Amino acid sequence: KLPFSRLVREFIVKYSDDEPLRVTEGALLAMQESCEMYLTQRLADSYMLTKHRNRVTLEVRDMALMAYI
Amino acid sequence: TKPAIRRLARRGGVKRISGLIYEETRGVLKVFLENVIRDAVTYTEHAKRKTVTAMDVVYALKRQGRTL
């Protein structure tokens, strides 16, 4: 929860206007589920490049080709 | 944390990970989340309501393309 609440709090406050925007547990849990799978997806796709590169170590090299696309 | 990144890599089938991934992974996500939270916050505040709901998160995800 520690790095998730920080980002949520920073960005609700950053992107508020007259006030921070309440929120529910389902909203917070729904967001947290979504964001986890996004990192799983992009790391895994970049890992597909890793295997294609005849290496076993996911590296910032592999993260960059999916990110460039 | 370091094991949360490890946990995400092992979910994706990644066995071992280099040390820069830790910082790189946080950056990539914030971009995603900035859009999710921004969009959610923007829709939630604009749409006759001031509370983020599960469907507002859903609305933010549709508005991504880093999903498609």
Domain ranges of chain A: 1-69
CB A50 within 8 A of CB A65: no
A36: Cβ–Cβ under 8 A, 6 or more apart, which residues?
Answer: B8
Q: Structurally, how many domains does chain B consist of?
A: 1
Report which of A9, A42, A21, A31 is spatially closest to residue B25, judged by C-alpha positions: A42
- Resolution in Å equals 4.4
Q: In sequence order, what are the residues at sequence separation of 6 or more whose Cβ sits closer than 8 angstroms to the Cβ of residue A65?
A: A46, A49
The technique by which this structure was obtained is: X-ray
Phi-psi group of B32: left, alpha or beta (phi > 0 → left; psi -120 to 50 → alpha; rest → beta): alpha
Q: Is the domain A1-69 a CATH 3.40.50.970 member?
A: no
CB atoms within 10 A of CB B38: 16
Chains A, B: CB contacts within 8 A come to 119
Q: Look up the domain containing B10 and give its range.
A: 1-68
Residues 18-57 on B with a CB inside 8 Å of A are 18, 20-21, 24-26, 28-30, 32-34, 36-38, 40-42, 44-45, 50-54, 56-57
